Amino acid sequence: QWQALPVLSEQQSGAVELILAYAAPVLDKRQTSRLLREVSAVYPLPAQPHLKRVRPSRSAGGAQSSDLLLCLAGPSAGPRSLAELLPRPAVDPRGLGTPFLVPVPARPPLTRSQFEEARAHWPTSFLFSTQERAAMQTHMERVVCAAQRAAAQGLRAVGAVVVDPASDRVLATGHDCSSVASPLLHAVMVCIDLVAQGQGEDSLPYVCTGYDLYVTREPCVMCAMALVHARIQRVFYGAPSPDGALGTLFRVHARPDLNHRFQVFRGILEDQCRQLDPDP
Amino acid sequence: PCVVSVQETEKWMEEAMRMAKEALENIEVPVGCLMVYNNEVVGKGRNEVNQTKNATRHAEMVAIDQVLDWCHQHGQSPSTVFEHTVLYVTVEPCIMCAAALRLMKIPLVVYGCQNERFGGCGSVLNIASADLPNTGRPFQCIPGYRAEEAVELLKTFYKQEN
Ligand SMILES: [Br-]
Ligand SMILES: [Br-]
Ligand SMILES: [Zn+2]
Ligand SMILES: [Zn+2]
């Protein structure tokens, strides 16, 4: 039992902003399909495709009713009638009630606590599926197994794997290897070295473009920044690290001033990973 | 044995400059650097990213590997060498390299021009003196040495890339 949390920038972690739109009740349930077609051909809402156009509502007895998302509100959002909002003959407003203003999410939700606030106002589009969840689990039991091997040997208990999501082919597994002679062989630095030596003669030095990295615990500053330099596309990790740079102390995967950004999900097999070693 | 390295800053940095020029010529980000322990150069590195096809192979990390090789081959504890080593580099260490020098417990970096795209000693983040109780020790910086010369080479390189 576990769940994947997105680490987004502070800017994107806040509440989704709202904008005002006009909605109207569907008093004739059997006009719904027809009215949805005619309305969203006039008001296709091209910049808010995450909004569902039909909002259901279960009565206190299960009796269902619905309002329809007519259009966005203008600069002066006063009361507005059906005759003023929907042109004719292009729309036949039979079956609709008097329009009303409703706040709606301006942008699609990203975090699951943002889906919560946003579905409160108006239903939206959207975490991981069964098939994917099991697959991400397999890659993370692999890093855990690797972290345990390092702990038994005498090294830091940090496991990393690099995976190609196009074929789900593991490209490099490695654990921490820091020694007195070689103190910077953190789990992430070892995987980047392993992918690097395995790539072909015609390769750009962005050794990790497109690839996913799963690591037991969140990378240190050195590892994280290297991931940005290497152009990893997604990073999954289990437990945070106190000095971690993908969510704890820094969020280098989501800065504007670096020429690369990437998604980070924390909390995958976190129950197991939490008892392992933090980076560094 | 630390400030003893600082006396030839002129010479040490002139030599870092000649390597930045080399990197420039070989389509690498023009950044060169030396690592001086007890007035002897124990490690040099220019940026080797495009040659090795390994994004992490920055000048500073090529030099660190070279010092660690020197420590291995001569049987010297890297802790006692790095802690009295000064790094001379023509460009302010990136965020990654700054964390590297911290974890190596290097005490002092002398550097040239600001790293506006990736700098880790204040320009983008301040990894160099941040409060990171588990990421090594913070180091100190003498910025600015021959910065006008060094920044020109960056500006040249990026006018040259796609
Ligand atoms: Br999930
Ligand atoms: Br940040
Ligand atoms: Zn690390
Ligand atoms: Zn660097």
Author numbering:
A (entry chain B): 25 to 150, 164 to 317
B (entry chain A): 14 to 175
Authors' text:
ADAT2/ADAT3 is a heterodimeric enzyme complex that edits adenosine (A) to inosine (I) at the wobble position 34 of tRNAs starting with an A in their anticodon (ANN-tRNAs). It recognizes specifically tRNAs through the ADAT3 N-terminal domain (ADAT3N), which subsequently rotates to present the bound tRNAs to the ADAT catalytic domain, composed of the C-terminal domain of ADAT3 (ADAT3C) and ADAT2, that carries the catalytic activity. Given the ability of inosine to pair with uracil (U), cytosine (C) or adenosine (A),22 the A to I conversion at position 34 provides an extended base pairing capacity to the modified tRNAs and is essential for decoding the C-ending codons, as GNN-tRNAs do not exist in eukaryotic genomes. Mutations in ADAT3, the catalytically inactive subunit of the ADAT2/ADAT3 complex, have been identified in patients presenting with severe neurodevelopmental disorders.
